[PDB]
């Protein structure tokens, strides 16, 4: 059992050593927003003028803004 857990621990330590992006250049086949990559945009229906309001609070809850 010790060996079989040490394998996973080694993998986790390796993933820890990365820590982020510093060292990784930008890549053009893999932007950071999946909508650019997947070509997704709205249409004509399903767009109410009262939607942007709720949009904002979603934003406010994602960025951490506690006001709501």
């Amino acid at each position: 059992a010790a060996v079989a857990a040490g394998w996973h621990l080694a993998s986790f330590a390796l993933n820890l050593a990365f820590w982020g992006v510093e060292g990784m250049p930008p890549d053009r086949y893999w932007p950071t927003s999946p909508r650019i990559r997947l070509q997704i945009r709205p249409g004509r229906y399903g767009n109410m003028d009262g939607g942007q309001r709720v949009y904002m609070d979603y934003l406010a809850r994602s960025e951490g803004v506690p006001l709501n």
């Binding site: 390796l14 050593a17 990365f18 820590w19 510093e22 060292g23 990784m24």
Partner: protein, 189 residues
């Protein structure tokens, strides 16, 4: 002569495209490593003359690549995977540790090579004595410096040793080695 119209006194040798990028500007000819970031000679020049650092970087990285380093072959689409592992699949911290270790190793190796070069200088200065039979005991500093910068092929070394052993003549030097061109086969490599 083949030349029907025009023929200078030295025959024209058809020079071809270069096949490899030149040594950078920061490197030396020897084995000892470069300088991490800035060279040392940069300190003895005009600030408006040290623009050749970044220009050389631009030239080697982007604008002067010889079209022979851009051939798509079956060997290169596998070397791509090796290199992409090293650059994107390995964390920069382990790469940094390996970099430090490799630097230390190269310093030890360069020290060894310098010791060997001085030993060779005594040996050939001794061989020229047998050669001339009499007085000659010197050596050639030109050959020492050429040995340190890896500018001799093995055949040139052997022929120089023989010339020394037979006729002294310590100042007759083999011509110089030319750089090795990039080997290409076909779609293969």
């Amino acid at each position: 002569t083949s030349a029907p119209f025009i023929s200078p006194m030295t025959p024209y040798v058809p020079e071809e495209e270069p096949t490899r990028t030149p040594p950078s500007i920061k490197d030396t000819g020897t084995l000892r490593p470069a300088s991490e970031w800035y060279p040392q000679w940069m300190q003895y020049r005009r600030r408006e003359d040290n623009y050749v650092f970044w220009q050389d970087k631009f030239m080697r990285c982007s604008t002067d690549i010889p079209w022979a380093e851009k051939r798509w072959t079956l060997f290169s689409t596998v070397w791509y995977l090796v290199q992409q592992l090293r650059f994107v699949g390995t964390p920069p911290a382990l790469r940094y540790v390996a970099f430090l270790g490799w630097r230390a190793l190269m310093f030890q190796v360069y020290a060894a090579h310098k010791a060997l070069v001085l030993w060779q200088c005594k040996l050939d200065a001794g061989l020229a004595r047998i050669g001339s039979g009499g007085a000659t005991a010197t050596f050639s500093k030109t050959m020492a410096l050429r040995r340190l910068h890896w500018r001799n092929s093995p055949l040139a070394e052997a022929l120089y040793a023989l010339n020394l052993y037979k006729t002294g003549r310590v100042h007759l030097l083999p011509p110089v080695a030319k750089p090795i061109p990039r080997p290409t086969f076909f779609w293969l490599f």
